[PDB]
Design a protein around this ligand. Structure first.
Ligand SMILES: [Cl-]
Ligand SMILES: [Cl-]
Ligand SMILES: [Cl-]
Ligand SMILES: [Cl-]
Ligand SMILES: [Cl-]
Ligand SMILES: [Cl-]
Ligand SMILES: [Cl-]
Ligand SMILES: [Cl-]
Ligand SMILES: [Cl-]
Ligand SMILES: [Cl-]
Ligand SMILES: [Cl-]
Ligand SMILES: [Cl-]
Ligand SMILES: [Cl-]
Ligand SMILES: [Cl-]
Lengths: 161, 161, 161, 160, 161, 162, 161, 162, 161, 160
């Protein structure tokens, strides 16, 4: 488990609201971060999960939490996915491309014989420390409302040691 | 992470319903299993978590899911905790002692500088494959109803590929 | 260079004329093959090159030459690219996905800090021997008509040593 | 034997008279120390041994001697044990928790396939030097009046 | 491939228009360079390729491109070749001798079991970066007019990222 | 420590009651054994420890316990000591000589910078398992009465585990 | 020196009287051999030494001695040299090409920073044993008539030990 | 052979004529030294060799030669030996104890499987350089008078080179 | 020292009474042997030592003791020395030549910075075990009479434990 | 081969008419040197080779050329040979002894399994660079007159 460790430095391209931006660990410092990994854009699997986090994106921003989705696809592919799927289209958070797999491996989350990330979610606090981890196989869905509870609880223990 | 891997062989003592028993991987074969790790008996962090799983234990048992809690304390210590805590007293599943940390290290779950296991939950299917993982920091509580939901989804995809 | 070496075994998923297929080195045996590498689907480069090769595919097939394009994108992404670009839409040869980068590293052709393949073309004869190589930087376009001339010349020396 | 070697640095949590304290090697400097290892709290073995040392404890303190019991349990388990065994209840010295086993391994005293310490007693002089060692199997009891006898001889040779 | 890497330092003798000159990497700095490798002087091969590059040479020089052919023969042998074949005779560019094979190995282009260079062409820009590579087997000819096209495209892109 | 390990093979010469014998690990099997180490014969310390054990040997022999003293002196040296010390003269157990230090190092009991064994006592049961260990610095005496208590106690647990 | 050792295996191309032949160590077995090394064909050195051995060649053949000259040039280069220099033209023994430098290194005779052989002569008996070694710097000429005296003395001691 | 090498630093306790002393390589600097090794005190082998050297000791001392006998026994055992043997009793030179074996190993003279020194004699000049070596098995006796012949010769050659 | 070790195998040429012989360790088996090392033939130092041993050789022969002198000179040189020194001429035992130093190094008796043997004597019993060793600096003479006394002692102890 | 490399430093004893001397690389600096190796003194094979060089020695001295013969024998042994043999007695150049084999190994000219140098001749210029090498087996003779031809030719090339 990477629980209670500091995230490693990284530098990736991302797509966010119709534009390309670069993201590094410096963008996460002093912020709450959710890293949301998934295997592949354009898979026949319906992206319910990515869109649920999208639905909750408003509250997450009021709690000072940024959301980053990550797959080993490129940011170009993200822009195309964002254009063709109605569910993906409502995403307003950053979609990080990790074709080198460096970000994915930082989180020990690479399926090495497929070149894809596992279905993992990491909650990271402003000092870069990982406070929560959830991983599931392709049939077990990640519940975005459960994520919010965990994030809110994490902020609480930060305030009340 | 260990997602989608086979659990490793192990041999531990446990306390269960007033008795000391031995538990091994052979006890898990052909069953659904939940491994519930926690840092320490008698911390006076209220064992809200252990008791939640206890409340749901009858329900879990009807789905054919066994539950094993695990810490690096001994089974002697578990028996004493069980006699002294009203909440722990209602645990009817096996409380595994792991003073060597072998069981804990099998799940890659040791805080090496404290000698205690992290707050991790692993769902293991009847073939020994880890299908879901949840890990939290010391302040963020694991929700047994979410565990239950994940187990049912895990059981669903097994029956309907 | 890899000139005059035998290509190595490989197994990839690919998209071809509306379907997903598996390609292995066994598919190239007894055939002439062109492996046409590029960095990324949905890239700012209008894919003129992929399309130039497309125009010549009927001529190439009459020479018994198979064409495989290759990037580290997934085959899913290929299907989407084929659907959204009028130029890509006219590709009827196999588009191989190489997310593990194994195929790309076989041809020593990976930009390791980008996780993308270089702009390289390999001509492979029916015995699996690499007979021609062209690699260019991102501004210099590969000319499919120059490719044809080389292939016919390669076929001539095979017939008349 | 670790006889005549200097103890190694360590940093552990402990229970001592209703409170949790941190203990390190720096706490032993300039002092005589007895390190009293045992396998496990709440084991069915009755802890007559830990309690005999308690009976002798004011006397030891009058000699400027600190006592530390050590097991691989946590200080949490010690506090609980302290509430439940009438015998353990009379301990007024520090009960050190060693869940990492580092303290135990410093003294070469870990049963590696059990994750528990052996039944060992070490006497350490004010310079951190080990002056006496006793180790027994689980049926053979350590006698605290003999411990006292050994400490007093050690203090004598220190003086001469 | 060596695409987009910087050429390595080198120091060789060459024959150019009736004289022996020394060439080092310092001669290529601030200039465009074509390094044109071939296996052996006086080969049964009609040196059509070397002579074709000669015909296009004036044009290449006005675009600021210097040309160096390189073989593992000595410069003495080049000089003799230049005197006996009318085709080699029309070469006005520098002919580098590489009997130690160092220049050749810098470009990773040695057939170690023959001690001869492969049929490789490298286009190198003024900062020493390799921008184009072409390699062929013994029957497939390199077309100097397509070399020019590539060079002109490379120059456009230097000026217009 | 060496607690709960099996003693290692060894082969040494010993002085025992007016004779030279060879002692091996084979001689200890099926018996209770005490290995009693000390630094040097003819030393400035009066050998009260060795004499003290001698006082208890008959008790020890009725309980089926063999005693072996060990130093890195030779068996020749033990014989001579036995003739010159009034204390040593009453020793009826085997005095093992260990000039190679192998028996001593088997018990991890060598002071390498002096080439002398440390002041250590080991109780070993019939299966060759070490059941008690005692090691002390040079000014802290080893009590033979307390040794007996440990041995009697060790035999009780062997007969009544739990 | 290599005096009194057995020559190493080799397989080289050579030019001999207008044809290309392969020479191996198997060709030297059961015969006397002279291996005559020099740095480079077409060198500014007028090849007085090579033509001198030729004048004595008919005589050498009556003694059962074969002659092999060796440079790191190719056999192609030997053929051209043989055609343009009158002195070289009278060579009727085999001219071995050693572009890999393997034969030259077998005789420990490579100038490693030039990639050329030193001026060395080795006399080899029918069992492959080196019986004489002569090496000189460029100004000092090897005298073929002294070479003959040495071969006759070597043959004498073989017959009358 | 260590012939013509410089002896290595050392530090040992020794018994010399009723007193315990320390011997180090600094005691050999500027003197002629004889290091006379033997296997064991109180051994079955008649200590004639040490006694014969003792007979020549006033003559050796007149020539500025120090004598050091060495075994892997302690210096305590030497004092004891000195009191019980009439032969050893006439030794007035230093008896060095080497229980750690470092001195014996310095002279490459240890029998490792016995933990005892071999029967070796070394002559060392005032500069620390070894000028003569003699080694024999347990039955072949060293002639103290031949030792003496050599020391005088070694002293001659030192003062009259060539 | 080498005391109580078995001599190692050796094969050397030697001069004995007008003849050249080969001595090996098989010559020493079942015999008592003296190996008498010295630094050099024809040296300023008086060969008193080889001669005093020669004076006793008849008595030594009666006791079944063979003598071998050894230096790193050749057996040729021993022959010449035997012809020039009235003293060495009396020697009837084998004079072993050791130009490789092997026999000398077998006995750890080489002055490495001089290539000469030290002044050493070894008495070896019929089982090849070294029973007595004497080594001296250059001014201190070895007394062959003492040597005989030791050999006699050695034979006695062999016969009487 | 060692052709065109600089000789390595050395320090050897030698016999030079009557007396023993020490030769080192400094005695070769600034001068032309011939190092003439052979296997062994007093060998049955007659020193025709060493004598031939002696005959040409006065011509060699006039060209500023020094001669050193070398074997793994000692200088003591060389001296004795110089008296026993009429051929050898004519020798006026330095006979170097090389018992450690260092000089010989410097010229890569040692037969390791025999401890004798091979039959090799090295011509060295005043800058210490080896300009000519000839090595032969025991039946083939080194002709002294050709050694001069090579040296004069070396010197010609040296000036031009
Ligand atoms: Cl993880
Ligand atoms: Cl994990
Ligand atoms: Cl390539
Ligand atoms: Cl990858
Ligand atoms: Cl210990
Ligand atoms: Cl542990
Ligand atoms: Cl390349
Ligand atoms: Cl121990
Ligand atoms: Cl030892
Ligand atoms: Cl050579
Ligand atoms: Cl050489
Ligand atoms: Cl090469
Ligand atoms: Cl020695
Ligand atoms: Cl020796």
């Amino acid at each position: 488990s990477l629980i209670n460790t500091k995230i490693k430095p990284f530098k990736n391209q991302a797509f966010k609201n119709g534009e390309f931006i670069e993201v590094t660990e410096k963008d996460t410092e002093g912020r709450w971060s959710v890293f949301f990994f998934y295997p592949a854009d354009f898979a026949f699997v319906c992206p319910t999960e990515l869109g649920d986090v999208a639905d909750h994106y408003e509250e997450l921003q009021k709690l000072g939490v940024d959301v980053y989705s990550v797959s080993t696809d490129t940011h170009f592919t993200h822009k195309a996915w964002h254009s063709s799927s109605e569910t993906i289209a409502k995403i307003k958070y950053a979609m990080i491309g990790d074709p080198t797999g460096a970000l994915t491996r930082n989180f020990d989350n690479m399926r090495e014989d497929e070149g894809l990330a596992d279905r993992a979610t990491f909650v990271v606090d402003p000092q870069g420390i990982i406070q929560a981890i959830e991983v599931t196989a392709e049939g077990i869905g990640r519940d975005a409302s459960d994520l919010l509870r965990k994030i809110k609880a994490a902020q609480y223990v930060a305030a009340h040691p």
